[PDB]
Design a protein around this ligand. Structure first.
Ligand code: CL
Ligand code: CL
Ligand code: CL
Ligand code: CL
Ligand code: ZN
Ligand code: ZN
Lengths: 257, 257
């Protein structure tokens, strides 16, 4: 009958549905390819790495719409996150969708690591795709993340030129309330030094992989990753009052779950 | 055209498929309900807990087939594993399917914890369902597990009367090769005491949650959980030569991945 599924050696009665049923997909990870489109496509379809989506630097338009490549069905995991951790989860491939953005990433120029700006055409294509994914799985804003957020010791992508605040204004990803940032500054100048351990606690709670007995460099990488996402005007990895205030405002607004 | 999916604000080109694409579902967890069918169904459809499937103690037959209840679509997680760990993963709800077996579990009788046998009708219904799930997601034999295997400090289910060897003979779950068990015994009587730490290392590698500085009781719970699954004639949690030999033979056959 209705709600009865015939199988080989048994039948399934589907008439009673549990309330506790949730998506396995909880996180959306943003990457850059550090490579041109064709080479990125070749890599992302090889035996070692993949992503669910690949967005050209300037997507071609057909039928009045930008074209985006889908390489892996969303129901399956892609191999995009590697060793990773976010808000208490590990193995983020298992519970994420990975979007690759064609973009050069960083290139050293007189020794300075300089990042490549994202073209507006690419961001404008990304926006509806991201909104569709977020709506489909009820992804929380704090779970739209940089690869660097989940693997801070290893990765920088999508880096300090990625327009997170713009995307937040369009309903994609977390951003603190300006008045609350000012509140947590508590009269301090933005670059006033802060107890490093105090900041690392906040970042651990927001979701960054923080362990006991980290070296100074490891400590710097976590703070830098956070700054690249949320305080991109200065990502030297040094704990200051503004970086702390942003973490405090994020935690107040989005919690730790 | 073919391989082009029209969306709102973009289109998807699905013509190039990545090779690195795998199921998000990797583990099949077996439970008992410790409750009658109707009460189990009520619980498993409430706000706090659920499973993908619920198998009656003696399934009713319609169309010459046993009926099994499905409560959660496999694409979604159910809330069946709780705090858990297996072969380096945590949060096993995310990457598992949970099957609940209607069965009383344990009941104390003159203080002795006695388990309830599984009726052959229930096991015979379980077999084709398990084979279908395993085939669908390419689940490895070592990843068909007891709830107790993934939460040894908290759970005993499905307990020492669950017929794992019988299921292994039907292609469901891991079981060591008898000749290899004898080989790793290395001339020792089965109950000869073994260095507890030596056994805990093997269990950690097989996939059990083993931490540094565990108390004697915590150590006993991990060994007991292992024995309930693989050496059910004696599950006192004491390290002996037979328990070690089984762990050694399992590791040789199935590895750690
Ligand atoms: Cl990457
Ligand atoms: Cl990676
Ligand atoms: Cl349970
Ligand atoms: Cl639980
Ligand atoms: Zn990346
Ligand atoms: Zn259980």
């Amino acid at each position: 009958e209705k709600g009865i599924v015939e199988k080989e050696g048994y039948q399934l009665d589907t008439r009673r549905q549990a309330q506790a049923a949730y998506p396995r997909i909880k996180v959306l990870v943003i990457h850059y390819t550090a490579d041109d489109f064709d080479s990125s496509l070749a890599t992302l379809t090889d035996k070692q790495v993949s992503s669910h989506y690949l967005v050209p630097a300037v997507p071609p338009r057909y039928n009045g719409k930008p074209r985006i490549w889908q390489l892996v069905p969303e129901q399956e995991l892609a191999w995009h996150a590697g060793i990773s951790a976010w808000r208490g989860a590990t193995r983020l491939n298992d519970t994420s969708i990975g979007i690759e953005l064609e973009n050069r990433g960083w290139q050293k120029s007189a020794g300075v690591k300089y990042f490549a700006p994202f073209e507006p055409a690419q961001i404008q294509a990304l926006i509806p795709l991201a909104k569709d994914i977020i709506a489909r799985y009820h992804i929380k804003p704090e779970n739209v993340v940089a690869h660097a957020d989940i693997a801070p010791q290893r990765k920088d992508d999508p880096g300090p030129l990625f327009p997170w605040q713009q995307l937040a204004q369009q309903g994609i990803g977390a951003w603190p309330d300006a008045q609350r940032v000012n509140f947590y500054l508590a009269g301090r100048a933005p670059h006033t030094p802060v107890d490093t351990a105090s900041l690392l606690e906040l970042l651990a709670r927001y979701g960054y992989d923080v362990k006991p007995d980290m070296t100074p460099r490891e400590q710097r990488r976590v703070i830098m990753a956070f700054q690249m996402h949320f305080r991109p005007t200065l990502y030297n990895g040094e704990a200051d009052a503004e970086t702390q205030a942003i973490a405090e405002a994020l935690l107040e607004k989005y919690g730790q779950d």
